[PDB]
Amino acid sequence: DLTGISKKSRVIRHHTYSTNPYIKLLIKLYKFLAKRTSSGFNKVVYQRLIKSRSNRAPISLSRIAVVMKRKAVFTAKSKAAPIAVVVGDVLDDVRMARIPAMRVCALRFSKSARQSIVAAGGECLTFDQLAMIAPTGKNTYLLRGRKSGRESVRHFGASGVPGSHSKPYATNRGKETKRGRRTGRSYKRKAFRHV
Amino acid sequence: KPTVSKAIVKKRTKRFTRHRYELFPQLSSSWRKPRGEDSPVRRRYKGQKAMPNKGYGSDRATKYITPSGFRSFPINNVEDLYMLVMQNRKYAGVISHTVGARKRKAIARKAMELDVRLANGNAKLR
Amino acid sequence: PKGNNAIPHVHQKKHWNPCSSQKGNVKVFLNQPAQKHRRRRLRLLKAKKVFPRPLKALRPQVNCPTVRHNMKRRLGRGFSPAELKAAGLNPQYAATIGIRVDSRRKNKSEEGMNVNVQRLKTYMSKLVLFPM
Amino acid sequence: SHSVDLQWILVRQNSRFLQKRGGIRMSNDPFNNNGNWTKRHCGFLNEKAAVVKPAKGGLADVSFRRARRMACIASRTAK
Amino acid sequence: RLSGMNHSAHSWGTGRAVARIPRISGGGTSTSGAGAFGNMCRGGRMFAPTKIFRRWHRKINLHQKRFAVVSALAASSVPSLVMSRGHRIDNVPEVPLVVEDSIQGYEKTKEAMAFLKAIAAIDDVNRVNDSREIRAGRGKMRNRRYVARRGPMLVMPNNKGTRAFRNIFGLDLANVSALNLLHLAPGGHVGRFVIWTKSAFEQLDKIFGTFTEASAVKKGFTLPAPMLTNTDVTRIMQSEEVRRVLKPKKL
Amino acid sequence: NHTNHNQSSKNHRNGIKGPMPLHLHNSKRGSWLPALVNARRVRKHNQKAALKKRRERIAAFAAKN
Amino acid sequence: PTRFKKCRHQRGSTFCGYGRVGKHRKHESGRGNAGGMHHHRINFDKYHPGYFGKLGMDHYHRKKNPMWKPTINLNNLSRLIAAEEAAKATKGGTLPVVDLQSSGYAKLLGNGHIQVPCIVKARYVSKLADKKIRKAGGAVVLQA
RNA sequence: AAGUUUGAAAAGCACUUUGGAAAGAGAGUGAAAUAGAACCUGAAGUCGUGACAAAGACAAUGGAAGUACCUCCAUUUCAAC
RNA sequence: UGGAAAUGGGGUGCCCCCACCCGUCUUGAAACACGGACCAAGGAGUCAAACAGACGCGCAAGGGAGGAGAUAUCCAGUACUUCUCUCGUACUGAAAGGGAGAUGCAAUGCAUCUGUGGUGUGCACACGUCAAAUCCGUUUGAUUUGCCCAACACC
RNA sequence: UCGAACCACCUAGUAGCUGGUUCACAUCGAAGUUUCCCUCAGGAUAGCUGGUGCUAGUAGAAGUAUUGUGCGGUAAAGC
RNA sequence: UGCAAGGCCGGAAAGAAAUUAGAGGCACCAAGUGGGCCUUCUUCGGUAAGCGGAGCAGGCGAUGCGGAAUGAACCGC
RNA sequence: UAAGCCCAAUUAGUGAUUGCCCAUUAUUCCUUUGGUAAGGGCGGAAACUUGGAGAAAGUGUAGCCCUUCCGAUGUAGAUGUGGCCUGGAGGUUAGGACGAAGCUUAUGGCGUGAGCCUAAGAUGGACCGGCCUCUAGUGCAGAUCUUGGUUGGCG
RNA sequence: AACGUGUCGCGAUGGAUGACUUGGCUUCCUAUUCGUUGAAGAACGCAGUAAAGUGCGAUAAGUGGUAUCAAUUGCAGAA
Ligand SMILES: [Mg+2]
Ligand SMILES: [Mg+2]
Ligand SMILES: [Mg+2]
Ligand SMILES: [Mg+2]
Ligand SMILES: [Mg+2]
Ligand SMILES: [Mg+2]
Ligand SMILES: [Mg+2]
Ligand SMILES: [Mg+2]
Ligand SMILES: [Mg+2]
Ligand SMILES: [Mg+2]
Ligand SMILES: [Mg+2]
Ligand SMILES: [Mg+2]
Ligand SMILES: [Mg+2]
Ligand SMILES: [Mg+2]
Ligand SMILES: [Mg+2]
Ligand SMILES: [Mg+2]
Ligand SMILES: [Mg+2]
Ligand SMILES: [Mg+2]
Ligand SMILES: [Mg+2]
Ligand SMILES: [Mg+2]
Ligand SMILES: [Mg+2]
Ligand SMILES: [Mg+2]
Ligand SMILES: [Mg+2]
């Protein structure tokens, strides 16, 4: 039975390699919900828990504020404030002085991000406490948080290939800016090339 | 004290011994897979001895079932009998060959008093 | 192979390994817990020997030099002839009653000695100096 | 602030009781109503009830098929 | 640092019907022409002769050494975690046990024993001296001849009444000022039925703080935030509000 | 020893990936300037319009709500 | 941990993962970074583009203390005024008085719009920084 | 190279008699001599004799599948499924 | 069958018929290629550092020390620690040096929150759709999170 | 022992070369080609391959045909 | 003015190029390999070859099983 | 007067099919195992005799339970394993002069296997097993391996 | 048949293994560093019976001092 179908198998990460006993509770909570419900949320929030720690990028309160201000500008203006769910964890943002009274549900908060919320007027939730309020996740604004600009993702590449604005692995920052990275050293890594 | 029903048919009986095991008083009756590039066993010729596959796995419904029904469970003292007595249909005790004689009688006494079948005994009383 | 690794620059090419042929040139700190106990044992045993004197002498405030540290204050060794003269004490007699003396400091800003001249007469107040 | 389903994630792998002897995974539990090492049969973790003649209690009444034998032990062995 | 290399041997050369390894040089002796300083041979150098600049000691972030001691005391107040992990607390009157701090007063130990009956925690003390056996297997020839169990430790605020309790076998003596993991959770298992003299809860709120204030001594250290407060994740999967939005079945 | 054998079957294991469509890397860059200098200024206006069109929305969506 | 290793995991494999044709040798592709311009040139030119040259003028006795200029932005000033120190920034109309070099941060860079009005005292200040603060109810002050 | 590390104790085999004496057979010591100084355990390898299928060689070994007879090995029935 | 059979095992021999000495280099080993009497015990990816990637954990615009001290305690451990440093929150230039918010009016001024479009989870929106009944699969608007592509601004 | 003695040491000298490299099962699974190298008994780089993935993915799918629409100068032919 | 052009755009648009539709897209880390050989088809060099060099696909290598008595490659699989 | 060759045949000009034999192929049937492949249950009820639509919310096992599909070779290599094993540590559970380690094997059984457990020793005499973590000088048939010992040739 | 096999029981050789371990190694620590006043080294010696070794030097397996109590021990001898 010739197939060719040998490499079409995708790596889905069936479970979590985490050993945190308080996330294996959220995972069994969100296998029950993600399986025995017609919730699109519970499906999605379950693969994001079993997901790793480098893939659950943190969203700063700045990101949470701005996108919850882009929701709350087009609502019934008295309907409700949706819950900003992030399956990573929330970090404070000293670039946002004034924060609205927004409800947030993260696996974790900074000690400065929990107080910034509670001082603002909102209440930060948990996931055993969100399974009580919209377990199906009605009126919840699910969030990732930027994982680009991460210093790992901007070494990815070659950095000597034309059109590769990646950072070479070099402790000495003033080591490799010579020949090959100069227009007057017999070739300059071509900053642009159509791909 | 009686077993529970099963389907105890077994796939293979002859153990998997390593190759050229008899030609050398040094090798062991313990399967090591032949890493040989041109070994006849690894490339699986006809009259060669087989290699443990997943395909030889026992039926799981009757896997680990001693020929007397009664999947086995090692027993060290009489208090481990009570921890077995609820599965005295599904499990059987096995005293551990280091439990001496003074304690091994104190067990085989309790087993019959508990109907917890032991795979070990029959000293003028079964 | 190699590939997208940082150029190592490891600097271990000078017979540091104490092998069978080379005596080795490594300093392993397997004795620092013994030494911490060792010093605090001398320290606490030197303190009851110098008693009733303070174990540490008196050192002045001095400004850490460079632009990176100039705002950080620090305890330098000895005061100066100047603070001692501007506080009465002979630097020969200050150097024998616990005050530490530095004939090299230059008192470049009066600002500097003012913090330390007054810092002496705090000590010279709360010091008994009972005779022999 | 600690429920039973958390008192089970911590002990699932190791205890005084887990008694993994081979691959059997029995348990020297108080609540020996089944002798297994499951999350529902061990009353050491939960507020559950064991099965002896006193029937000490802290549902899940597999005590039915667990006390019938408990009494028939002494009967069929009193000789 | 020069063991197994102490000979002065050289391989005879690939011209004589032997292996090519350094061979001892000389005569008369039985080592003359024997294998020298390889893995293979007697008096032969080890593989990777171990070095004292191995990495013997580990760093641990302070917040992980504290939040390990923190989560080790939380289990010492969970009697299910103490019944498992092997402490006999079947008729202990309460966990976390606390005792009126009339115990730095015991100056003889015949009474410091009669204390451990007042709590029936003498059960966990007798399982420590009944379980005193010769160690197994080259621990005994080293300085680890005997093996006991860890017994219930008595946590003191000060170091005053350690005299009546120092000789009792079992019954660790700890100090509130320096809670010591590897004692508060030995073998990596959280548990350790503790006794907690009355004067020892005084500081735990002070020396660890609350979920919203820093401690007195662990400075800047506040208790962490529980990832989920209603830790009974099953008692909400069987809740009224969840069953309303479940998906119905059909067979 | 040049062979080219097994190569066409190596290029077809992980497949000869199709080209990216035109909406990928459609950087009209390095091309003829008087076009892209005009297709630039018209992008600036069309962005001032995109920002302006959202300004009435929210303000219409406020009072008219 | 030695049991968590692959040549301990792959006992009996006879090669610990280094092959039969190309046998695991000692140094066989040069030793060190050798061959950066000869036979590893494709690695260096392509993952280390700027290596192998000279550039700029030599600064012989380089001292990092006189060349020390840490930077803080305007949106990061709030990182130096506690809520209590900002509780006086609420009453009395007393602007916060921030002094950078005590927290590090010689130079004051102007990034973002300053959240809280204050008066920073910095050794160095950018032109756009010097202008955002003096038009947000604030004032830069040069020190040292 | 070489732990004689016998045993708890030398209690280290008195004595009888076969041998020229050794050694052997007996006794005797001791918990063990089947712990007898070349001594705790005593493995593999090889060898010996006793037995056997007493088989049966026409390379050995091995694979699968049976059968012959023999195995205090397991299990089960031993008034029954 | 009633207390020794019956099965399963495994020992031996036999019958049938299957089967080329293993390891190895090599495109190719039964090779007239190399190594191979036997057995016992030894015997080969190891530690250190510097990196990176992944994964686990802590905290997070901070993180972490190290060295050292401090003083309670069997305790080379554990507990505490201001101070500092370190990495980074800001990059760039060969260097002097410089140094990034957006929108409207302007060509600097004033209110001073995704920056643009596009591809785009989830949920709320109404939209009907065999739909047991009506909760969900369909979908279209809204905002679009992450991501990516394009081209703004700014350093 | 001599086309450079012998002993000890540097030294466990270096070897792109030869030999070896110790458990099981499971899941997959190749390459001898590209370019560069005092390179051709070796490397580096792509390809092949595994693992971990991320992601809205009946699509930006195809070693296939159809349909149109281009391209070509080998076979045969013709001198 | 309006055509045409670019960046756009809403109103509106459906098919009366077959099949599989055995899911697209990137990304990261890392080996091993870098001595191939045979073969089909065609074909360069050679007196020739179980020859050297190629193109194509298939194999062997890395693989048995079945049978061409026998055979790395053939025929089936 | 074929068991050769070339053509045909396939139950015999009677009436329309497969003469017949062989596989690691095909079909079907069981059994394993992986896919994270789909499902369904994921705590108490009855079909004449028991098993399960009552065994636990679970990657991984002696699977939570069923049943369903599909795939299953493989050198170099990669990876996984609630996977195997040796020495030692921290825990726990536990044995031992009424006989521990060791050792022997026609001692069975049971795991696909690594291996484990048992019995019985006219063995041994004093230590040590299971489990969770930790740890490493951790698995050997093969290196003209090293050392010790034996053996053939061989009286 | 004998020999050669071959399995089993019992023996022999062998000295692995286990158990033990007054040794090694490693780490740390508290104090003071030989000789012309003849050192280190080696040489020969010395015991009732002593070859080696340990100890000692023709005061020789030790003399003296103190401080301890009845042995030394293969067996003599000896308050
Ligand atoms: Mg960034
Ligand atoms: Mg079997
Ligand atoms: Mg040695
Ligand atoms: Mg040497
Ligand atoms: Mg042992
Ligand atoms: Mg190689
Ligand atoms: Mg090669
Ligand atoms: Mg100044
Ligand atoms: Mg070669
Ligand atoms: Mg050849
Ligand atoms: Mg949009
Ligand atoms: Mg022609
Ligand atoms: Mg084939
Ligand atoms: Mg033929
Ligand atoms: Mg060891
Ligand atoms: Mg133990
Ligand atoms: Mg080794
Ligand atoms: Mg061996
Ligand atoms: Mg050999
Ligand atoms: Mg030994
Ligand atoms: Mg000297
Ligand atoms: Mg002299
Ligand atoms: Mg002498």
XYZ file of N, CA, C and O (backbone and C1' of nucleotides) in Angstrom, chain J residues 37-66:
210
model
P 37.645 27.408 -4.055
O 38.322 26.754 -2.777
C 38.701 27.556 -1.672
C 39.120 26.725 -0.485
C 40.204 25.696 -0.728
O 41.497 26.265 -0.750
C 38.478 24.740 0.565
P 42.539 25.876 -1.902
O 42.969 24.391 -1.548
C 43.557 24.080 -0.298
C 44.755 23.185 -0.466
C 45.498 22.834 0.812
O 44.941 21.691 1.445
C 47.030 23.447 -0.924
P 43.629 21.792 2.369
O 42.417 21.505 1.378
C 41.624 20.340 1.531
C 40.664 20.172 0.383
C 40.918 18.991 -0.533
O 40.397 17.782 -0.013
C 40.463 20.941 -1.812
P 41.385 16.634 0.512
O 41.092 15.406 -0.453
C 39.787 14.867 -0.585
C 39.542 14.383 -1.990
C 40.719 13.686 -2.660
O 40.815 12.317 -2.317
C 39.770 15.281 -4.139
P 41.916 11.825 -1.261
O 41.056 11.453 0.022
C 39.788 10.833 -0.127
C 39.416 10.008 1.077
C 39.300 10.772 2.398
O 38.216 10.244 3.157
C 40.844 9.009 2.628
P 36.890 11.113 3.421
O 37.403 12.377 4.225
C 37.911 12.258 5.541
C 38.162 13.615 6.146
C 36.938 14.490 6.332
O 36.212 14.168 7.501
C 38.630 15.747 5.300
P 34.764 14.801 7.753
O 35.075 16.258 8.290
C 34.123 17.295 8.148
C 34.793 18.628 7.973
C 33.874 19.776 7.612
O 33.254 20.354 8.738
C 35.674 19.742 6.122
P 31.684 20.169 8.954
O 31.077 21.596 8.627
C 31.761 22.774 9.010
C 31.766 23.791 7.903
C 30.450 24.007 7.196
O 29.540 24.799 7.930
C 32.136 23.779 5.595
P 28.049 24.267 8.163
O 27.253 24.878 6.943
C 27.562 26.170 6.466
C 27.222 26.286 5.011
C 25.873 25.738 4.611
O 24.819 26.624 4.926
C 27.500 24.996 3.082
P 23.381 26.049 5.323
O 22.573 26.115 3.959
C 21.477 25.253 3.731
C 21.394 24.869 2.284
C 20.513 23.682 1.970
O 19.144 24.027 1.908
C 22.567 23.450 0.851
P 18.059 23.154 2.697
O 17.943 21.836 1.821
C 17.695 21.914 0.428
C 17.931 20.587 -0.243
C 17.395 19.373 0.494
O 16.017 19.162 0.258
C 19.611 18.959 -0.194
P 15.039 18.756 1.457
O 15.429 17.253 1.770
C 15.164 16.228 0.830
C 15.919 14.974 1.168
C 15.692 14.422 2.559
O 14.488 13.689 2.680
C 17.998 14.458 2.110
P 13.314 14.220 3.636
O 13.311 13.208 4.855
C 14.198 12.109 4.901
C 14.850 11.990 6.255
C 14.071 12.528 7.438
O 13.019 11.696 7.881
C 16.289 13.252 7.594
P 11.812 12.342 8.710
O 12.396 12.498 10.173
C 12.717 11.358 10.949
C 13.335 11.757 12.258
C 12.443 12.574 13.169
O 11.599 11.753 13.951
C 14.536 13.634 12.972
P 10.221 12.310 14.543
O 10.668 13.414 15.590
C 11.285 13.041 16.810
C 11.801 14.241 17.556
C 10.768 15.292 17.896
O 9.989 14.954 19.025
C 12.664 16.338 16.991
P 8.464 15.433 19.118
O 8.586 16.981 19.436
C 9.366 17.416 20.536
C 9.655 18.889 20.463
C 8.455 19.787 20.298
O 7.704 19.940 21.480
C 10.170 20.508 18.865
P 6.113 19.931 21.361
O 5.869 20.224 19.818
C 5.033 21.289 19.402
C 5.829 22.507 19.012
C 5.017 23.681 18.506
O 4.456 24.442 19.553
C 6.848 23.313 17.067
P 2.872 24.647 19.628
O 2.668 26.116 19.063
C 3.660 27.105 19.284
C 3.769 28.058 18.124
C 2.465 28.469 17.475
O 1.763 29.451 18.210
C 4.043 27.954 15.805
P 0.160 29.456 18.210
O -0.220 29.525 16.673
C -0.011 30.713 15.936
C -0.430 30.558 14.500
C -1.862 30.136 14.261
O -2.789 31.189 14.452
C -0.424 28.951 12.808
P -3.990 31.022 15.506
O -5.289 30.888 14.604
C -5.561 29.678 13.918
C -6.667 29.842 12.909
C -6.628 28.893 11.727
O -7.174 27.625 12.039
C -7.120 31.101 11.001
P -6.259 26.306 12.015
O -7.090 25.293 11.105
C -6.512 24.678 9.958
C -7.125 25.197 8.681
C -6.643 24.521 7.400
O -7.687 24.533 6.416
C -6.045 26.807 7.356
P -9.240 24.521 6.846
O -10.015 24.179 5.500
C -9.874 22.916 4.858
C -9.381 23.087 3.445
C -10.338 23.805 2.498
O -9.621 24.747 1.699
C -9.769 21.660 1.619
P -9.530 26.275 2.197
O -8.584 26.989 1.135
C -7.655 27.982 1.547
C -6.242 27.555 1.244
C -5.757 27.823 -0.173
O -5.277 29.147 -0.341
C -5.290 25.582 0.398
P -5.116 29.785 -1.806
O -3.739 30.575 -1.713
C -2.947 30.796 -2.872
C -1.661 30.007 -2.825
C -1.752 28.640 -2.151
O -0.905 27.723 -2.834
C -0.139 29.965 -1.046
P -1.489 26.808 -4.018
O -0.905 25.365 -3.699
C -0.594 24.994 -2.366
C -0.642 23.502 -2.193
C -0.359 22.690 -3.440
O 1.021 22.597 -3.735
C -2.248 21.808 -2.335
P 1.501 22.583 -5.264
O 1.362 21.055 -5.673
C 1.804 20.034 -4.787
C 1.429 18.663 -5.282
C 1.989 18.308 -6.652
O 2.248 16.908 -6.713
C -0.366 18.257 -6.728
P 3.607 16.303 -6.112
O 4.491 16.014 -7.399
C 4.743 17.032 -8.358
C 5.226 16.455 -9.662
C 4.300 15.420 -10.290
O 4.432 15.472 -11.706
C 6.368 14.411 -9.770
P 3.306 16.185 -12.591
O 2.590 14.983 -13.344
C 2.040 13.896 -12.621
C 0.707 13.503 -13.194
C 0.149 14.427 -14.260
O 0.714 14.209 -15.536
C -1.536 13.931 -12.699
P 0.669 15.369 -16.642
O -0.856 15.428 -17.092
C -1.382 14.469 -17.995
C -2.879 14.333 -17.868
C -3.726 15.280 -18.690
O -3.801 14.917 -20.054
C -4.610 15.129 -16.516
P -3.796 16.061 -21.178
O -5.157 16.835 -20.915
C -6.395 16.180 -21.098
C -7.555 17.077 -20.758
C -7.660 18.368 -21.538
O -8.185 18.171 -22.836
C -8.081 18.783 -19.254
